[PDB]
Amino acid sequence: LMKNPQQDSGLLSNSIDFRDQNLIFSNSGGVCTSSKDKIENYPAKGYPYKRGVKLSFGDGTTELEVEAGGGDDLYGVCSDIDEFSGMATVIPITNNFTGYLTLKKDGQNGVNPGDKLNFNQHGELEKVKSVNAIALSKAHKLTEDLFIVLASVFGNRA
Amino acid sequence: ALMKNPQQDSGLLSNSIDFRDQNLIFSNSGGVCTSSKDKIENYPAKGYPYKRGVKLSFGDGTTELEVEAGGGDDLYGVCSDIDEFSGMATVIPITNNFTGYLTLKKVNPGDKLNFNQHGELEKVSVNAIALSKAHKLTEDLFIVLASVFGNRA
Amino acid sequence: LMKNPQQDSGLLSNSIDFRDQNLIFSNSGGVCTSSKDKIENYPAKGYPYKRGVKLSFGDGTTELEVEAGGGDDLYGVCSDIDEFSGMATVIPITNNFTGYLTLKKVNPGDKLNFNQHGELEKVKSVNAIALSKAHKLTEDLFIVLASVFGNRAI
Amino acid sequence: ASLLDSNFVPINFTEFVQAISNTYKQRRIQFYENLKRHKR
Amino acid sequence: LFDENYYAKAVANIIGEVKDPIMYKWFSPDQIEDVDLQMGYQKTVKWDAFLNANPTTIANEVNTISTIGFSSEVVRLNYLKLQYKFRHLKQTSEKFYTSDSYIGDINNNLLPFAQAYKLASSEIIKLINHFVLTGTVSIQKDGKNQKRLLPNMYGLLNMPEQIKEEVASGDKDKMDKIFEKIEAGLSKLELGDEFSTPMMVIVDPATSLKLVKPYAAASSCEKWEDVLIQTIKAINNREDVYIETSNLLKHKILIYPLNSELIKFKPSKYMLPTPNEQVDKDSTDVAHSYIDFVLGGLLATRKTILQVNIKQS
């Protein structure tokens, strides 16, 4: 529920192996990043980290915000959050993205590389209509309810 | 009448004291928030498509292709600037998202907007989402802050 | 939910008056405290601060704990909590106490008893008398000055 | 270490910014020295 | 650096032409103290004591004594960093736009870097002044669509736990009713030990014109302003009372002392606009530059500011 674990650690980490040391929830950004990518930030409602975001409009006194969501209202994908300022870094749907994204905790075992994915109401990827997203790996479990997956999103589809 | 910079000269010096609501003018070219990684293209301009959606128009073949005000399934991009001396319109492709003021058909934040045949935004294919209510500059000129995110049904 | 509010204050406090400056949640202890009082500390199960506590037993792997409660299970009244260690300072029911206690959401001299959630309520088996009226610290948080002296007879 | 000093020569951008901060401070110091509020 | 970078030289040669902010009139020289922090927070601790109950009579033998309680309070001040971008003309491209009496493409609204920088700096300083007085950031004259800000970021007009007075709409033009509310607020003010200090009053222009009329059968040699100054001099130990007018306010009267102990302004040393080192360049003649500024740093004791709002229908 946070970019970095709230509870501290009791152990030092072992910096010996170099394989499979990236499947952590603190891994922000994307695995393959282009220097010609358009990057935005927005006020964040809730915790839309590693989730699809949509524009949220209030009464009018305050500016718009971004909240975890998908479906027909998908605006982009959140890749980073600064907790002090509550700023959510968002990559628009018109820009190509490849990274680890939150996966729905239902049939996550059935997710295999090369499977089509679409965003749900809560900004979580699920196995399939309107968004071009394909899983490049299998579900990796970080917590009893938290599952992440390597996926590539390359815009909307007809 | 519709040019970005009015031809009629001003009678009086403006009062440069206030700092609020001084950007809702038709001369405001570009976008409110612009990234250094945006793709922009100039094209020969057919008509006056400033602050309107544009579509590719082909002649007989003697001259190159140009851009004209339009939308619908033929929409190609959004015109954000124009140079009258050269008749070159700066076009941001539909594949690139844009945020700025655009012409609205003669509306509250959150409304879904699609371009019409004349390159004017109208309430609902969805291409952009309204960020504010219509602002009237002339009896027929209505602008609106909108954010374009490509095409989606 | 917390003895010391988590959110930092935005303003300095005004400290020129001297009246009615004690109706705060962080007022641990009692209004009138005797130097001959018996004080205990227990592991805390939840947030029983300024509430009636009862003994809670786990599965026997670890020592017992105290949780908010009352009725026929009352053991004492919590008056302070050390958040770092999760220790709850408890004064046993056999030792009389006078202080501000959580009130269920009342005139002075009314008889009070502890409910299932360790909150005082108007009346049976506990000698507790309210010495003032309810002070509203939050939309759901009410405190009251009360004196608890042993338990009654049924 | 201020822009008001003609002899000042910024070696790098960081020193240039520090001179700006010093220059702003000296100006507000100067402003209060020259300020004379109207009583009554 | 000046030899290598033209923009650095241009800013240094033009920084002296930017006018000082108007907020400085609102604070005493000692009330402002700069801090070295771009983004983050700063914390302070205050200690209070209170009496739990009536004192205990020491007669014969007694064990239960009344207690004196203590409480801690931690105050945090937040800081925020904001940035703006503006387009301008490349330095080498100025010679092809120089004209008889101006430089820049009038038809396309393009300017040299120097003039663009000065105009943007003035606009930002206007924005900063609005925030300090009113505690909000917005560009609409209606004040809506405000930028969401971090907590512990307040201005003089939105500071919580202060005395707030409202003048009824029907008495909007009745100066006696307005002065009545001011006195009620003045009575509730709690200066305490820090009373022998100068006081500051800020009013909107409409209020100021009402003040200058003679006091009311009208009196002679006595204006509503003079009566008000005497009333404030009653509670500040006959100290100086300053009155300023600000167009930023609208039907609002702000009264607060000028003592560093009660209200202190700790702005960042980088609050005022500063150029960024990053300059976008392209094959065309159009370049972009960035300006940074820092907000926050206002600290005030509670119930030490009087805020009078004159409701207009």
PDB file of all heavy atoms in Angstrom, chain B residues 4-5 16-21 23 27 29 34-36 81-83, chain E residues 85 87 106-109 123 126-127 130 138-141 247 280:
ATOM      1  N   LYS B   4      -5.680  35.241 -35.441  1.00  0.00           N
ATOM      2  CA  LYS B   4      -5.152  35.118 -34.085  1.00  0.00           C
ATOM      3  C   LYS B   4      -4.836  36.482 -33.485  1.00  0.00           C
ATOM      4  O   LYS B   4      -5.163  36.746 -32.323  1.00  0.00           O
ATOM      5  CB  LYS B   4      -3.910  34.228 -34.074  1.00  0.00           C
ATOM      6  CG  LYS B   4      -2.886  34.555 -35.143  1.00  0.00           C
ATOM      7  CD  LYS B   4      -1.640  33.701 -34.988  1.00  0.00           C
ATOM      8  CE  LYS B   4      -0.989  33.918 -33.631  1.00  0.00           C
ATOM      9  NZ  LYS B   4       0.256  33.118 -33.483  1.00  0.00           N
ATOM     10  N   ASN B   5      -4.202  37.359 -34.258  1.00  0.00           N
ATOM     11  CA  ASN B   5      -3.916  38.705 -33.792  1.00  0.00           C
ATOM     12  C   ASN B   5      -4.893  39.668 -34.438  1.00  0.00           C
ATOM     13  O   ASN B   5      -4.975  39.710 -35.676  1.00  0.00           O
ATOM     14  CB  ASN B   5      -2.486  39.102 -34.124  1.00  0.00           C
ATOM     15  CG  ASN B   5      -1.469  38.209 -33.456  1.00  0.00           C
ATOM     16  OD1 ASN B   5      -1.825  37.243 -32.786  1.00  0.00           O
ATOM     17  ND2 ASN B   5      -0.194  38.530 -33.632  1.00  0.00           N
ATOM     18  N   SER B  16      -1.489  46.906 -16.830  1.00  0.00           N
ATOM     19  CA  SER B  16      -0.725  45.732 -16.406  1.00  0.00           C
ATOM     20  C   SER B  16      -0.528  45.768 -14.890  1.00  0.00           C
ATOM     21  O   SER B  16       0.568  45.985 -14.370  1.00  0.00           O
ATOM     22  CB  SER B  16       0.604  45.671 -17.144  1.00  0.00           C
ATOM     23  OG  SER B  16       1.327  46.880 -16.984  1.00  0.00           O
ATOM     24  N   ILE B  17      -1.632  45.550 -14.178  1.00  0.00           N
ATOM     25  CA  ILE B  17      -1.640  45.521 -12.721  1.00  0.00           C
ATOM     26  C   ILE B  17      -2.158  44.188 -12.191  1.00  0.00           C
ATOM     27  O   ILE B  17      -1.555  43.584 -11.301  1.00  0.00           O
ATOM     28  CB  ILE B  17      -2.457  46.698 -12.140  1.00  0.00           C
ATOM     29  CG1 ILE B  17      -2.559  46.579 -10.620  1.00  0.00           C
ATOM     30  CG2 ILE B  17      -3.836  46.779 -12.780  1.00  0.00           C
ATOM     31  CD1 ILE B  17      -1.220  46.641  -9.921  1.00  0.00           C
ATOM     32  N   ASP B  18      -3.269  43.707 -12.739  1.00  0.00           N
ATOM     33  CA  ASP B  18      -3.825  42.435 -12.315  1.00  0.00           C
ATOM     34  C   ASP B  18      -3.083  41.283 -12.985  1.00  0.00           C
ATOM     35  O   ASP B  18      -2.404  41.450 -14.000  1.00  0.00           O
ATOM     36  CB  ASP B  18      -5.317  42.366 -12.640  1.00  0.00           C
ATOM     37  CG  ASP B  18      -6.037  41.300 -11.842  1.00  0.00           C
ATOM     38  OD1 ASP B  18      -5.396  40.675 -10.973  1.00  0.00           O
ATOM     39  OD2 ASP B  18      -7.245  41.091 -12.079  1.00  0.00           O
ATOM     40  N   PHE B  19      -3.217  40.097 -12.391  1.00  0.00           N
ATOM     41  CA  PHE B  19      -2.573  38.899 -12.911  1.00  0.00           C
ATOM     42  C   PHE B  19      -3.543  37.734 -13.066  1.00  0.00           C
ATOM     43  O   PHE B  19      -3.101  36.610 -13.321  1.00  0.00           O
ATOM     44  CB  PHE B  19      -1.407  38.481 -12.010  1.00  0.00           C
ATOM     45  CG  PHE B  19      -1.836  37.810 -10.738  1.00  0.00           C
ATOM     46  CD1 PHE B  19      -1.606  36.461 -10.540  1.00  0.00           C
ATOM     47  CD2 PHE B  19      -2.475  38.526  -9.742  1.00  0.00           C
ATOM     48  CE1 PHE B  19      -2.001  35.840  -9.374  1.00  0.00           C
ATOM     49  CE2 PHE B  19      -2.873  37.910  -8.574  1.00  0.00           C
ATOM     50  CZ  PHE B  19      -2.634  36.566  -8.390  1.00  0.00           C
ATOM     51  N   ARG B  20      -4.844  37.968 -12.928  1.00  0.00           N
ATOM     52  CA  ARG B  20      -5.836  36.906 -12.976  1.00  0.00           C
ATOM     53  C   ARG B  20      -6.699  37.035 -14.223  1.00  0.00           C
ATOM     54  O   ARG B  20      -7.056  38.145 -14.629  1.00  0.00           O
ATOM     55  CB  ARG B  20      -6.722  36.928 -11.729  1.00  0.00           C
ATOM     56  CG  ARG B  20      -6.008  36.503 -10.457  1.00  0.00           C
ATOM     57  CD  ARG B  20      -6.869  36.746  -9.230  1.00  0.00           C
ATOM     58  NE  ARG B  20      -7.135  38.163  -9.018  1.00  0.00           N
ATOM     59  CZ  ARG B  20      -6.756  38.840  -7.944  1.00  0.00           C
ATOM     60  NH1 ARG B  20      -6.081  38.262  -6.964  1.00  0.00           N
ATOM     61  NH2 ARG B  20      -7.059  40.132  -7.850  1.00  0.00           N
ATOM     62  N   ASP B  21      -7.028  35.889 -14.820  1.00  0.00           N
ATOM     63  CA  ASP B  21      -7.913  35.818 -15.984  1.00  0.00           C
ATOM     64  C   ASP B  21      -7.413  36.692 -17.132  1.00  0.00           C
ATOM     65  O   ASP B  21      -8.184  37.412 -17.769  1.00  0.00           O
ATOM     66  CB  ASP B  21      -9.349  36.184 -15.606  1.00  0.00           C
ATOM     67  CG  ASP B  21     -10.176  34.974 -15.231  1.00  0.00           C
ATOM     68  OD1 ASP B  21      -9.610  33.862 -15.181  1.00  0.00           O
ATOM     69  OD2 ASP B  21     -11.388  35.133 -14.982  1.00  0.00           O
ATOM     70  N   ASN B  23      -5.453  35.191 -19.631  1.00  0.00           N
ATOM     71  CA  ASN B  23      -5.021  34.230 -20.632  1.00  0.00           C
ATOM     72  C   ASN B  23      -6.166  33.711 -21.487  1.00  0.00           C
ATOM     73  O   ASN B  23      -5.923  32.911 -22.397  1.00  0.00           O
ATOM     74  CB  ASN B  23      -4.315  33.045 -19.967  1.00  0.00           C
ATOM     75  CG  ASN B  23      -5.251  32.221 -19.112  1.00  0.00           C
ATOM     76  OD1 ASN B  23      -5.820  32.718 -18.140  1.00  0.00           O
ATOM     77  ND2 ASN B  23      -5.418  30.952 -19.467  1.00  0.00           N
ATOM     78  N   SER B  27      -5.447  35.093 -28.880  1.00  0.00           N
ATOM     79  CA  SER B  27      -4.057  35.121 -29.310  1.00  0.00           C
ATOM     80  C   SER B  27      -3.181  34.125 -28.565  1.00  0.00           C
ATOM     81  O   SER B  27      -2.000  33.995 -28.902  1.00  0.00           O
ATOM     82  CB  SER B  27      -3.481  36.527 -29.136  1.00  0.00           C
ATOM     83  OG  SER B  27      -2.125  36.569 -29.539  1.00  0.00           O
ATOM     84  N   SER B  29      -1.516  31.160 -28.202  1.00  0.00           N
ATOM     85  CA  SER B  29      -1.148  30.031 -29.039  1.00  0.00           C
ATOM     86  C   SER B  29      -0.441  28.961 -28.219  1.00  0.00           C
ATOM     87  O   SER B  29       0.182  29.245 -27.193  1.00  0.00           O
ATOM     88  CB  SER B  29      -0.244  30.483 -30.185  1.00  0.00           C
ATOM     89  OG  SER B  29       0.953  31.053 -29.683  1.00  0.00           O
ATOM     90  N   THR B  34       3.078  22.213 -21.709  1.00  0.00           N
ATOM     91  CA  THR B  34       3.768  21.689 -22.878  1.00  0.00           C
ATOM     92  C   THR B  34       5.059  21.016 -22.444  1.00  0.00           C
ATOM     93  O   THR B  34       5.818  21.578 -21.648  1.00  0.00           O
ATOM     94  CB  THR B  34       4.070  22.801 -23.884  1.00  0.00           C
ATOM     95  OG1 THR B  34       2.857  23.484 -24.220  1.00  0.00           O
ATOM     96  CG2 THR B  34       4.683  22.224 -25.149  1.00  0.00           C
ATOM     97  N   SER B  35       5.305  19.822 -22.966  1.00  0.00           N
ATOM     98  CA  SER B  35       6.534  19.099 -22.685  1.00  0.00           C
ATOM     99  C   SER B  35       7.579  19.387 -23.751  1.00  0.00           C
ATOM    100  O   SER B  35       7.256  19.711 -24.896  1.00  0.00           O
ATOM    101  CB  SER B  35       6.276  17.594 -22.619  1.00  0.00           C
ATOM    102  OG  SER B  35       7.493  16.874 -22.651  1.00  0.00           O
ATOM    103  N   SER B  36       8.846  19.260 -23.362  1.00  0.00           N
ATOM    104  CA  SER B  36       9.929  19.402 -24.323  1.00  0.00           C
ATOM    105  C   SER B  36      10.015  18.224 -25.280  1.00  0.00           C
ATOM    106  O   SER B  36      10.767  18.296 -26.256  1.00  0.00           O
ATOM    107  CB  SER B  36      11.262  19.569 -23.595  1.00  0.00           C
ATOM    108  OG  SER B  36      11.565  18.422 -22.824  1.00  0.00           O
ATOM    109  N   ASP B  81      -1.003  26.473 -33.679  1.00  0.00           N
ATOM    110  CA  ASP B  81      -0.388  27.735 -34.059  1.00  0.00           C
ATOM    111  C   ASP B  81      -0.452  27.867 -35.570  1.00  0.00           C
ATOM    112  O   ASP B  81      -0.622  26.881 -36.292  1.00  0.00           O
ATOM    113  CB  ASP B  81       1.058  27.830 -33.567  1.00  0.00           C
ATOM    114  CG  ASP B  81       1.586  29.248 -33.580  1.00  0.00           C
ATOM    115  OD1 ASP B  81       0.812  30.166 -33.925  1.00  0.00           O
ATOM    116  OD2 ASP B  81       2.772  29.448 -33.247  1.00  0.00           O
ATOM    117  N   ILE B  82      -0.327  29.105 -36.038  1.00  0.00           N
ATOM    118  CA  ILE B  82      -0.382  29.405 -37.463  1.00  0.00           C
ATOM    119  C   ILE B  82       0.462  30.642 -37.730  1.00  0.00           C
ATOM    120  O   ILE B  82       0.491  31.579 -36.925  1.00  0.00           O
ATOM    121  CB  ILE B  82      -1.840  29.587 -37.944  1.00  0.00           C
ATOM    122  CG1 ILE B  82      -1.912  29.560 -39.468  1.00  0.00           C
ATOM    123  CG2 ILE B  82      -2.444  30.869 -37.397  1.00  0.00           C
ATOM    124  CD1 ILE B  82      -3.288  29.234 -39.999  1.00  0.00           C
ATOM    125  N   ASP B  83       1.176  30.628 -38.849  1.00  0.00           N
ATOM    126  CA  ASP B  83       1.944  31.773 -39.317  1.00  0.00           C
ATOM    127  C   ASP B  83       1.292  32.291 -40.589  1.00  0.00           C
ATOM    128  O   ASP B  83       1.292  31.601 -41.612  1.00  0.00           O
ATOM    129  CB  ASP B  83       3.402  31.394 -39.574  1.00  0.00           C
ATOM    130  CG  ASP B  83       4.279  32.599 -39.832  1.00  0.00           C
ATOM    131  OD1 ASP B  83       3.778  33.736 -39.712  1.00  0.00           O
ATOM    132  OD2 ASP B  83       5.469  32.414 -40.159  1.00  0.00           O
TER     133      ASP B  83
ATOM    134  N   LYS E  85       7.514  27.650 -17.147  1.00  0.00           N
ATOM    135  CA  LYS E  85       8.260  27.638 -18.397  1.00  0.00           C
ATOM    136  C   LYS E  85       7.723  28.716 -19.328  1.00  0.00           C
ATOM    137  O   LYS E  85       6.510  28.925 -19.413  1.00  0.00           O
ATOM    138  CB  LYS E  85       8.167  26.273 -19.079  1.00  0.00           C
ATOM    139  CG  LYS E  85       9.093  26.109 -20.264  1.00  0.00           C
ATOM    140  CD  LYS E  85       8.400  25.391 -21.410  1.00  0.00           C
ATOM    141  CE  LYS E  85       7.997  23.979 -21.021  1.00  0.00           C
ATOM    142  NZ  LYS E  85       7.351  23.257 -22.151  1.00  0.00           N
ATOM    143  N   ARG E  87       8.494  30.640 -23.362  1.00  0.00           N
ATOM    144  CA  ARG E  87       9.179  30.631 -24.645  1.00  0.00           C
ATOM    145  C   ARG E  87       9.791  31.995 -24.931  1.00  0.00           C
ATOM    146  O   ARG E  87       9.297  33.026 -24.470  1.00  0.00           O
ATOM    147  CB  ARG E  87       8.205  30.250 -25.759  1.00  0.00           C
ATOM    148  CG  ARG E  87       6.983  31.146 -25.804  1.00  0.00           C
ATOM    149  CD  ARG E  87       5.968  30.671 -26.826  1.00  0.00           C
ATOM    150  NE  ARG E  87       6.401  30.926 -28.192  1.00  0.00           N
ATOM    151  CZ  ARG E  87       5.637  30.749 -29.262  1.00  0.00           C
ATOM    152  NH1 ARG E  87       4.398  30.297 -29.159  1.00  0.00           N
ATOM    153  NH2 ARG E  87       6.127  31.037 -30.463  1.00  0.00           N
ATOM    154  N   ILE E 106       6.187  40.655 -33.347  1.00  0.00           N
ATOM    155  CA  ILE E 106       4.899  41.110 -32.832  1.00  0.00           C
ATOM    156  C   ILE E 106       3.782  40.189 -33.301  1.00  0.00           C
ATOM    157  O   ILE E 106       2.868  39.857 -32.540  1.00  0.00           O
ATOM    158  CB  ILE E 106       4.642  42.570 -33.252  1.00  0.00           C
ATOM    159  CG1 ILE E 106       5.731  43.482 -32.687  1.00  0.00           C
ATOM    160  CG2 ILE E 106       3.261  43.022 -32.808  1.00  0.00           C
ATOM    161  CD1 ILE E 106       5.409  44.953 -32.801  1.00  0.00           C
ATOM    162  N   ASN E 107       3.839  39.762 -34.563  1.00  0.00           N
ATOM    163  CA  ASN E 107       2.776  38.938 -35.122  1.00  0.00           C
ATOM    164  C   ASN E 107       2.666  37.582 -34.444  1.00  0.00           C
ATOM    165  O   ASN E 107       1.591  36.977 -34.472  1.00  0.00           O
ATOM    166  CB  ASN E 107       2.994  38.747 -36.620  1.00  0.00           C
ATOM    167  CG  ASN E 107       3.339  40.040 -37.320  1.00  0.00           C
ATOM    168  OD1 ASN E 107       2.536  40.968 -37.359  1.00  0.00           O
ATOM    169  ND2 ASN E 107       4.543  40.110 -37.873  1.00  0.00           N
ATOM    170  N   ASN E 108       3.745  37.090 -33.839  1.00  0.00           N
ATOM    171  CA  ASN E 108       3.750  35.777 -33.213  1.00  0.00           C
ATOM    172  C   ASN E 108       3.968  35.827 -31.708  1.00  0.00           C
ATOM    173  O   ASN E 108       4.077  34.769 -31.081  1.00  0.00           O
ATOM    174  CB  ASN E 108       4.819  34.893 -33.862  1.00  0.00           C
ATOM    175  CG  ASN E 108       4.433  34.446 -35.250  1.00  0.00           C
ATOM    176  OD1 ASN E 108       3.382  33.841 -35.452  1.00  0.00           O
ATOM    177  ND2 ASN E 108       5.282  34.750 -36.224  1.00  0.00           N
ATOM    178  N   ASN E 109       4.039  37.019 -31.116  1.00  0.00           N
ATOM    179  CA  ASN E 109       4.228  37.186 -29.677  1.00  0.00           C
ATOM    180  C   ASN E 109       5.507  36.494 -29.205  1.00  0.00           C
ATOM    181  O   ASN E 109       5.491  35.591 -28.368  1.00  0.00           O
ATOM    182  CB  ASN E 109       3.009  36.678 -28.901  1.00  0.00           C
ATOM    183  CG  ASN E 109       1.703  37.155 -29.493  1.00  0.00           C
ATOM    184  OD1 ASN E 109       1.439  38.355 -29.558  1.00  0.00           O
ATOM    185  ND2 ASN E 109       0.876  36.215 -29.929  1.00  0.00           N
ATOM    186  N   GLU E 123       5.251  38.642 -12.972  1.00  0.00           N
ATOM    187  CA  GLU E 123       4.004  37.903 -12.800  1.00  0.00           C
ATOM    188  C   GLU E 123       4.101  36.902 -11.658  1.00  0.00           C
ATOM    189  O   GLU E 123       3.160  36.757 -10.869  1.00  0.00           O
ATOM    190  CB  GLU E 123       3.624  37.195 -14.098  1.00  0.00           C
ATOM    191  CG  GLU E 123       3.349  38.136 -15.248  1.00  0.00           C
ATOM    192  CD  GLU E 123       2.356  39.217 -14.880  1.00  0.00           C
ATOM    193  OE1 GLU E 123       1.198  38.875 -14.559  1.00  0.00           O
ATOM    194  OE2 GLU E 123       2.729  40.408 -14.913  1.00  0.00           O
ATOM    195  N   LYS E 126       3.885  38.676  -8.379  1.00  0.00           N
ATOM    196  CA  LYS E 126       2.487  38.973  -8.099  1.00  0.00           C
ATOM    197  C   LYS E 126       1.770  37.749  -7.546  1.00  0.00           C
ATOM    198  O   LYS E 126       0.957  37.860  -6.624  1.00  0.00           O
ATOM    199  CB  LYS E 126       1.791  39.472  -9.364  1.00  0.00           C
ATOM    200  CG  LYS E 126       2.318  40.796  -9.878  1.00  0.00           C
ATOM    201  CD  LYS E 126       1.551  41.263 -11.101  1.00  0.00           C
ATOM    202  CE  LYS E 126       2.129  42.560 -11.637  1.00  0.00           C
ATOM    203  NZ  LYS E 126       1.412  43.033 -12.850  1.00  0.00           N
ATOM    204  N   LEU E 127       2.053  36.571  -8.109  1.00  0.00           N
ATOM    205  CA  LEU E 127       1.436  35.346  -7.614  1.00  0.00           C
ATOM    206  C   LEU E 127       1.868  35.044  -6.184  1.00  0.00           C
ATOM    207  O   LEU E 127       1.053  34.613  -5.360  1.00  0.00           O
ATOM    208  CB  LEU E 127       1.782  34.177  -8.532  1.00  0.00           C
ATOM    209  CG  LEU E 127       1.164  32.843  -8.123  1.00  0.00           C
ATOM    210  CD1 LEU E 127      -0.321  32.821  -8.444  1.00  0.00           C
ATOM    211  CD2 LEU E 127       1.882  31.688  -8.790  1.00  0.00           C
ATOM    212  N   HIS E 130       0.044  37.256  -3.641  1.00  0.00           N
ATOM    213  CA  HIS E 130      -1.324  36.802  -3.418  1.00  0.00           C
ATOM    214  C   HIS E 130      -1.375  35.651  -2.424  1.00  0.00           C
ATOM    215  O   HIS E 130      -2.242  35.619  -1.545  1.00  0.00           O
ATOM    216  CB  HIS E 130      -1.950  36.386  -4.745  1.00  0.00           C
ATOM    217  CG  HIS E 130      -3.357  35.896  -4.622  1.00  0.00           C
ATOM    218  ND1 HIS E 130      -4.388  36.696  -4.182  1.00  0.00           N
ATOM    219  CD2 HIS E 130      -3.904  34.690  -4.891  1.00  0.00           C
ATOM    220  CE1 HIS E 130      -5.510  36.001  -4.181  1.00  0.00           C
ATOM    221  NE2 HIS E 130      -5.245  34.780  -4.606  1.00  0.00           N
ATOM    222  N   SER E 138      -4.222  30.518  -7.118  1.00  0.00           N
ATOM    223  CA  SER E 138      -5.189  30.387  -8.197  1.00  0.00           C
ATOM    224  C   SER E 138      -4.962  31.516  -9.190  1.00  0.00           C
ATOM    225  O   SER E 138      -4.429  32.570  -8.835  1.00  0.00           O
ATOM    226  CB  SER E 138      -6.628  30.417  -7.670  1.00  0.00           C
ATOM    227  OG  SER E 138      -7.560  30.259  -8.723  1.00  0.00           O
ATOM    228  N   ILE E 139      -5.367  31.280 -10.437  1.00  0.00           N
ATOM    229  CA  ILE E 139      -5.277  32.294 -11.481  1.00  0.00           C
ATOM    230  C   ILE E 139      -6.635  32.823 -11.901  1.00  0.00           C
ATOM    231  O   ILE E 139      -6.693  33.872 -12.560  1.00  0.00           O
ATOM    232  CB  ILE E 139      -4.520  31.770 -12.717  1.00  0.00           C
ATOM    233  CG1 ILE E 139      -5.274  30.600 -13.344  1.00  0.00           C
ATOM    234  CG2 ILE E 139      -3.106  31.375 -12.343  1.00  0.00           C
ATOM    235  CD1 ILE E 139      -4.792  30.238 -14.724  1.00  0.00           C
ATOM    236  N   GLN E 140      -7.720  32.142 -11.559  1.00  0.00           N
ATOM    237  CA  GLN E 140      -9.048  32.656 -11.846  1.00  0.00           C
ATOM    238  C   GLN E 140      -9.392  33.772 -10.873  1.00  0.00           C
ATOM    239  O   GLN E 140      -9.072  33.699  -9.683  1.00  0.00           O
ATOM    240  CB  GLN E 140     -10.086  31.542 -11.750  1.00  0.00           C
ATOM    241  CG  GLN E 140      -9.840  30.385 -12.692  1.00  0.00           C
ATOM    242  CD  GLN E 140     -10.974  29.383 -12.682  1.00  0.00           C
ATOM    243  OE1 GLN E 140     -11.963  29.556 -11.973  1.00  0.00           O
ATOM    244  NE2 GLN E 140     -10.836  28.328 -13.472  1.00  0.00           N
ATOM    245  N   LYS E 141     -10.042  34.819 -11.385  1.00  0.00           N
ATOM    246  CA  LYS E 141     -10.471  35.902 -10.509  1.00  0.00           C
ATOM    247  C   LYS E 141     -11.542  35.434  -9.534  1.00  0.00           C
ATOM    248  O   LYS E 141     -11.678  36.001  -8.444  1.00  0.00           O
ATOM    249  CB  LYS E 141     -10.978  37.080 -11.337  1.00  0.00           C
ATOM    250  CG  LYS E 141     -10.867  38.415 -10.628  1.00  0.00           C
ATOM    251  CD  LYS E 141     -11.221  39.562 -11.556  1.00  0.00           C
ATOM    252  CE  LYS E 141     -11.029  40.904 -10.868  1.00  0.00           C
ATOM    253  NZ  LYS E 141     -11.424  42.037 -11.750  1.00  0.00           N
ATOM    254  N   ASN E 247      -5.231  46.095  -2.925  1.00  0.00           N
ATOM    255  CA  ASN E 247      -6.279  45.719  -3.865  1.00  0.00           C
ATOM    256  C   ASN E 247      -6.554  44.223  -3.851  1.00  0.00           C
ATOM    257  O   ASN E 247      -7.610  43.796  -4.330  1.00  0.00           O
ATOM    258  CB  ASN E 247      -5.896  46.169  -5.273  1.00  0.00           C
ATOM    259  CG  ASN E 247      -4.471  45.807  -5.627  1.00  0.00           C
ATOM    260  OD1 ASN E 247      -3.759  45.197  -4.830  1.00  0.00           O
ATOM    261  ND2 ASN E 247      -4.042  46.184  -6.824  1.00  0.00           N
ATOM    262  N   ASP E 280      15.848  24.736 -23.221  1.00  0.00           N
ATOM    263  CA  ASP E 280      15.512  23.949 -24.399  1.00  0.00           C
ATOM    264  C   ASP E 280      15.951  24.677 -25.663  1.00  0.00           C
ATOM    265  O   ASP E 280      15.730  25.882 -25.806  1.00  0.00           O
ATOM    266  CB  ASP E 280      14.013  23.672 -24.448  1.00  0.00           C
ATOM    267  CG  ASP E 280      13.529  22.895 -23.249  1.00  0.00           C
ATOM    268  OD1 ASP E 280      14.362  22.567 -22.380  1.00  0.00           O
ATOM    269  OD2 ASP E 280      12.316  22.610 -23.178  1.00  0.00           O
TER     270      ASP E 280
END
